[PDB]
Design a binder for this molecule. Structure first.
Ligand SMILES: Nc1ncnc2c1ncn2[C@@H]1O[C@H](COP(=O)(O)OP(=O)(O)NP(=O)(O)O)[C@@H](O)[C@H]1O
Ligand SMILES: [Mg+2]
Length: 249
């Protein structure tokens, strides 16, 4: 019963336009204890205990859950006016978009996500859906991890092979995300269809090194896709590797 804290009153929520189309995600206004209204995003879909757990997460690189409304469940998240990282990367290759993102900003995006994942990993919370599209830009342009908790080409081999999903599978997905950032938005594995992905990986193939990327960066990405999950580093290792790489630039 005490997990009533996470529940938000339906009349404090005003729903507006669709943002994207399991269920709908909408823009909205949440009335706060402050008297003020906050712009929110609202994803429709036990399940309050996990949401209460997620509500307690508090890190600059992890999206904060505001609460839930219900029997129709909706999760309240802060609206991020700058949107997802994937779209940002792609827009940056176009005029009227952001300017050309230099390597340093790209590496800083990877650090933000790795810090975000280090936090979640320390609390044994699996993300299970990490991709550039589920990484959000704050108003200060720091990145935060989103859409965790509740995509074939972000899924580790052992997880395609069996039902298994660990933090090392999240690590695999972080690797692919790093590649998404390095390539400024390419879909993983050009020329490989989704249904041939398990056989492709089983034969030892991985994402190829982007053209002008440092070997040092590719080394880091690659370590994320080692066949044995135990051979993959932790997020705390990755995080420090990317910090020292960025530092050396
Ligand atoms: N907190 C938020 N603030 C602003 N926009 C958001 C937020 N959360 C999601 N969106 C956007 O709403 C749209 C639909 O969301 P979503 O269902 O997460 O689609 P998606 O990008 O395919 N991610 P997923 O379905 O988790 O793989 C996307 O454009 C999101 O970037
Ligand atoms: Mg998403």
């Amino acid at each position: 019963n005490k997990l009533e804290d996470v529940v938000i009153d339906r009349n404090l929520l005003i729903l507006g336009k669709i943002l994207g189309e399991f269920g709908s995600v909408m823009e909205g206004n949440l009335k706060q204890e402050d008297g003020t209204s906050l712009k929110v995003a609202v994803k429709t879909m036990e399940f309050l205990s996990e949401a209460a757990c997620m509500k307690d997460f508090s890190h600059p690189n992890v999206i904060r859950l505001l609460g839930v409304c219900i029997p129709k469940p909706m999760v309240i998240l802060p609206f991020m006016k700058y949107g997802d990282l994937h779209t940002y990367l792609l827009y940056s290759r176009l005029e009227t978009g952001p300017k050309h993102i230099p390597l340093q900003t790209l590496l800083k995006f990877m650090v933000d996500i790795a810090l975000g994942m280090e936090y979640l990993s320390n609390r044994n919370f699996l993300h299970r859906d990490l991709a550039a599209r589920n990484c959000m830009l704050r108003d200060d342009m720091t990145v935060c991890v989103a859409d965790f908790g509740l995509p074939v080409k972000w899924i580790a081999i052992e997880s395609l092979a069996d039902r298994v999903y660990t933090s090392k599978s999240d690590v695999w997905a972080f690797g692919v995300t790093m590649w998404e950032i390095a390539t400024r938005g390419m879909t993983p594995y050009p020329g490989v269809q989704n249904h041939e992905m398990y056989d492709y990986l089983l034969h030892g193939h991985r994402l190829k090194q982007p053209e002008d990327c440092l070997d040092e960066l590719y080394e880091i990405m690659y370590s994320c896709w080692r066949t044995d999950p135990l051979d993959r580093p932790t997020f705390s290792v990755l995080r420090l590797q990317l910090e020292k790489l960025l530092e050396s630039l």
